[PDB]
Homo-oligomer: A and B are copies of this chain.
Amino acid sequence: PHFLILNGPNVNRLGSRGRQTLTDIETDLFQFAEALHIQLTFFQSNHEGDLIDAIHEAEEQYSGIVLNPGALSHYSYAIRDAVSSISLPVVEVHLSNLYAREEFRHQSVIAPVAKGQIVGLGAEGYKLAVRYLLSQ
């Protein structure tokens, strides 16, 4: 199948701050996807509205979304409501272990309405969420 890999603000900057860049990760997932016969489309934006637009338009084109919303996780109730308004399965992903970082990162306002969440397992977390989605 075909899934959308949706990345939020600052995800593009992986690296100046794993050791991987966003581009490195996408190449590996493209490589990861061809091997298992599944299509992926990637999209990244720093704009909360661009992610909400893509979630609403996803419904007619993909069968699942893997979402890494960046720090929008912690406060965007508008992306939370976009996820609840669509019928596809969504999996929230974060590469670093949020629970070991600042306190404002320890709650996601998006996870309650998603299928679930993966935290702390690095870029592998995107492949694991792609595998979960295959099982739906």
Contact = CB atoms under 8 A, between A and B. Distances in A.
Interface of A: 8-10, 12-13, 16-17, 45-50, 52-53, 56, 59, 70-72, 74-75, 77-78, 80-82, 84-87, 91, 97, 99-100, 104-109, 111-121, 124-125, 127-128, 131-132, 135
* Chain A contact residues: helix, strand, loop or mixed: helix
A81 B9 contact: yes
User: Which among A46, A81, A97, A135 has the greatest number of chain B C-beta atoms within 10 A?
Assistant: A46
Contacts of A115: 97, 120-121
A56 B97 contact: no
19 contacts: A10-B52, A10-B56, A16-B87, A46-B52, A46-B56, A46-B78, A46-B82, A47-B48, A47-B50, A48-B48, A72-B78, A75-B77, A99-B114, A106-B107, A116-B119, A116-B125, A117-B118, A118-B118, A118-B119
